């Protein structure tokens with residue numbers, strides 16, 4: 001509920017979200033995993049905290065977050081869910097790993113808070 005705009009949250013929108021959206025492998029993460037549309041009967045049993053980059057993009061627009069660290073945790077949840085749910089050989093796993101590498105590169109260049 002307490003939410004806000006900081007230099008760091010601004011960077012999460014204008015650099016991190018904007019760069020990741022453009023990647024060739026980003027499209028599966030544009031919206032919540034839909035267990036009905038994708039015929040995944042155990043998804044919501046296995047993954048208790050779903051997250052996707054569409055939801056993060058909206059939270060940033062609605063000043064949902066108090067700090068960039070909160071936003072980073074949601075990206076982490078999005079990636080970790082993919083790794084936990086899927087098999088090691090699944091291409092979606094390699095897609096997530098490519099996105100997460102870029103995410104981390106951007107987080108490392110993020111301006112320090114205050």
Ligand SMILES: CC(=O)OC[C@]12CC[C@H]3[C@H](C[C@H]4O[C@]45CCCC(=O)[C@]35C)[C@]1(O)CC[C@@]2(O)[C@@](C)(O)[C@@H]1CC(C)=C(C)C(=O)O1
Pocket residue numbers: 028029032033034038040081082083085086090091092
């Ligand atoms: C269609 C869709 O959106 O997903 C389907 C799929 C992910 C994407 C896959 C692929 C099937 C192969 O068809 C390929 C062909 C080559 C490459 C490829 O990308 C896709 C489209 C799927 O692998 C089948 C199952 C699966 O649903 C997930 C469960 O593995 C999810 C789906 C989602 C949204 C996430 C984030 C997750 O953790 O995992």
